[PDB]
Symmetry: none
Subunit: 27 residues, 21 copies
């Protein structure tokens, strides 16, 4: 037999800030 | 027999802020 | 026999903020 | 025998904010 | 025997805000 | 034997806000 | 034997706001 | 034997707001 | 043997607002 | 003194395809 | 002194296809 | 004195494809 | 003195593909 | 004196592919 | 005196692919 | 005296691929 | 006297691949 | 028999700050 | 007098691959 | 007097690979 | 008089591999 159990609680993996992939800027 | 169980609670994987993929700026 | 069980809760994967795919700006 | 069970609760995968695919700005 | 069960509860996958596909602005 | 069961509750997939496909603005 | 069952409850997939396909503005 | 069952409840797929296909404006 | 069942309740696919196909204007 | 001038050329704001406001279907 | 000038050329706002407000099917 | 000038050329803001406001389906 | 000039050339802001506001699918 | 000039050329801000605002799928 | 000039060329800010605002999938 | 000048050439800020704002998947 | 000049050439800030804002997977 | 068990607590793997993948800047 | 000049050449700030803001996976 | 000059050449600040902001995995 | 000149040739500041901000993993 094979078993795998996963539990993510209240506020897992959430974004409350800023995620920027790529930023290019002149002056 | 094979089993896999996953539980995502309340507020898992949510976005409350900013997600920007790509940003280009002149000035 | 094969089983896979998943649960998602109240506010999973929800966007309450801003999602921008691509942004280009001059001045 | 094969089984797969998924449960999405109250407010999963909803948008309550802003989703922008693409944005271009001159100034 | 093959089974797949899905349940979406009260307010899944709904839009309460803004969805913009594409935006172009001169100024 | 094959089965697939899906349930969508009250306000699933509904729009209460604004959906804009494409937007072009001069000023 | 093959079965598929779908249930949409009270207010699925409804529009209570604005859906605009395409918008062009000079000013 | 093949079976398909669909149920749409009260205000499913209804419009209670505005649907605009295309919009062009000078000023 | 092949079967299909579809049920529409009270106000499925009803318009209780405004639908505009195409709109053009100057000032 | 206040002036506003707008010019629309040949096939501006025209439909040469399909515009559907709302669509519902069981199967 | 106040002025507004608007010009429509050949086929502004014309429909050369299909415009459907609302469509409910079934099977 | 105040002036605003806008020019839309041959084929601005036209639809040559498909615009669907809302779409609900089953099985 | 105040001036604002905008020019849209041949095929600006047009749709030649598909624009869907909202899509719900049972299967 | 104040001036702002904008020029959009041949095929600005056009859609030739697919724009989907919202998508909900059971299977 | 104040001046701002912007120029957009042939295929600026156009979509030729797929833009999806929100996607929810059961399986 | 104040001057700003911006130039976008052939194919700036365009999408030729896939932009997905949000994605939730059960399996 | 104040001046700011910006030039974006052929294919600046364009997406030719995949942009995903947020992704949640059960399995 | 093979078993693996994972429990992630209230606030595992969440972001409350700025994530920037790549950054380029002039002067 | 004050001057600022910026030049972005052919393929600056583009995406030709994958940009993922956030990713949550059960298995 | 003050002067600032920036030149980005062919393929500055582009993404040709994978940018992941945040990744969470249960197994 | 104050002067600053910056030049970035080639694919300066580009990503061709994998950028991951944060990575959390079970077994």
């Amino acid at each position: 037999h094979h078993q795998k159990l996963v539990f993510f609680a209240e506020d897992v993996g959430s974004n409350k800030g800023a995620i920027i992939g790529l930023m290019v800027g002149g002056v």
